[model samples]
Target: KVFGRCELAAAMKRHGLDNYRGYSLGNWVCAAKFESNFNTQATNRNTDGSTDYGILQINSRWWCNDGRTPGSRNLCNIPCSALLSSDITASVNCAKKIVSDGNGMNAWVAWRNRCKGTDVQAWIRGCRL
Candidate 1:
């Protein structure tokens, strides 16, 4: 099923993310496709052989210390999911957190600077961030 644009926008806002700033609709969709195919309950065997789960491909082991598995079924128990559901924004937030906690958004500064005036989709479709 196609995702809801309004829901995705809300997720982005909840996560304090601005898709127009660095990420794009295309990039977001592609990442979700690659990470979990838009499945909220998706799970995968990580490189370290641990299980990563959920729409964001959250690594359960990483957030286990946070009191719930990364893929906790109840979104309330997992704050991450509350901010961004099984949608594009979830992947962006998760990836940013992995790279630099909440500061990873700054990583986009360089690209945004260099790629001024570029369309969001073209700038970020294949980018890691």
Candidate 2:
């Protein structure tokens, strides 16, 4: 685990992710909580034979490669393992690129299903950054 909730919020703010791409920091925090529980090493295998990587749960189908998976687009040009690290730089950059591609945070299913239209302020409630 790279961060507790407040620490993650602070890091996201320091990285200029607060209100990034017109989305609030709470949205990002809330999505991260459900996707990976703030664990950098978290990974989930999807039903489509793809795996999601890191805190953002980026899918191998369009982003990074996990080696075991073939035919990846690798749009991020990174290995999936790179995202599974405590250092969140690569993950954050990739996530920004994804949102920039016009997917918004909707690229993450967890965000769409759990955070959209939900009260997400609690994700950063105690973080004073």
Q: Model 2, range 14-93, lDDT digits (tens) per residue?
A: 78788899988999899899999999999899988999999999989899988877776899999999999888888898
Residues 2-53, candidate 1: write the lDDT tens digits. 3443454345446655454455444444344445555666656656644555
Decoy 1 TM-score against native: 0.45
Model 2 has an lDDT value of 0.89
Model 2 pairs whose backbones collide: none
- Residues forming the 10-long window of minimal summed lDDT in candidate 2: 64-73
Highest lDDT model number: 2
